[PDB]
């Protein structure tokens, strides 16, 4: 197609332009090769403090705000990535906020699985690597935050998607027509179908062997929505039980009356 094949590469560009790191880079850092200098691994409090002294309260709470700084940076990138979507800037100023209110984290987790593996994930622009077992070590409720994401990322990574696939997937996550409070539920739905259409045609052409990759990703979308709901629940517990853990203004604004 003309537009369908073109719009797919436009969203791809906005992905690469606004999103670093991506998956192609995360796969380079991992699996060795073309690198030779592996990232500093963080598997205990010792390695954690070494990585902290080189960056400028409890350990669990410090790791907290470190992930908040990344969530905030990602949401910003998402806002820029969203504006480059055909039709997002044309929507109502309030409908743009809602699409990003329920979609940001649902996308953050999708993209997060690119820098993850059964053993850990890459942090600090790929220069570091934090092991999964170390996170399960921390005290509750912190030890339960990242664990569900690893599980999703494992089954998600099984689908063997690349940045072109993921880009369209993320865009679809943002152009969700059944978000609570959506005004023009009719215009967004049309925009959503256009995005979902290209995604479907793109997968049928980029993975001709996996003929059901499209419905699987749909399943994953439902999984991510559930995965955000539970995450938002665990965030409230941390906001109300941990006295030294303060949410970021931008982050507190998004969870405000979410689920």
């Amino acid at each position: 197609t003309a537009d369908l094949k073109s719009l797919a590469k436009r969203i791809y560009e906005a992905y690469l332009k606004n999103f670093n790191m991506n998956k192609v880079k995360a796969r380079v850092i991992l699996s060795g090769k073309a690198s030779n200098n592996p990232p500093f691994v963080i598997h205990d409090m010792e390695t954690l403090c070494m990585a902290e002294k080189t960056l400028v309260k409890e350990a669990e709470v410090r790791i907290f705000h470190c992930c908040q700084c990344t969530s905030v940076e990602t949401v910003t990138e998402l806002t820029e990535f969203a504006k480059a979507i055909p039709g997002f800037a044309n929507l109502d100023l309030n409908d743009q906020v809602t699409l990003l209110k329920y979609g940001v984290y649902e996308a953050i987790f999708a993209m997060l699985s690119s820098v993850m593996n059964k053993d850990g994930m890459l942090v600090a622009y790929g220069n570091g690597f934090i092991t999964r077992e170390f996170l399960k070590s921390l005290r509750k409720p912190f030890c339960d935050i990242m664990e569900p994401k690893f599980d999703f990322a494992m089954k998600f990574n099984a689908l063997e998607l690349d940045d072109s696939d993921i880009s369209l997937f993320v865009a679809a996550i943002i152009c969700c027509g059944d978000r609570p409070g959506l005004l023009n539920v009719g215009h967004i739905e049309k925009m959503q179908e256009g995005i979902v259409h290209v995604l479907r045609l793109h997968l049928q052409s980029n993975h001709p062997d996996d003929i059901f990759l499209f419905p699987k990703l749909l399943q994953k979308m439902a999984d991510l929505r559930q995965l955000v709901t539970e995450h938002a629940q665990l965030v409230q517990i941390i906001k109300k039980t941990e006295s030294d853990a303060a949410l970021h203004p931008l982050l507190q604004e998004i969870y405000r009356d979410m689920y």
């Binding site: 806002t79 504006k83 906020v97 990003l100 209110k101 203004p249 931008l250 604004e253």
Partner: peptide, 10 residues
């Protein structure tokens, strides 16, 4: 809210 919309207006 106040942020986000402060961003969308860019």
């Amino acid at each position: 809210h106040k942020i986000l919309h402060r961003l969308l207006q860019e």
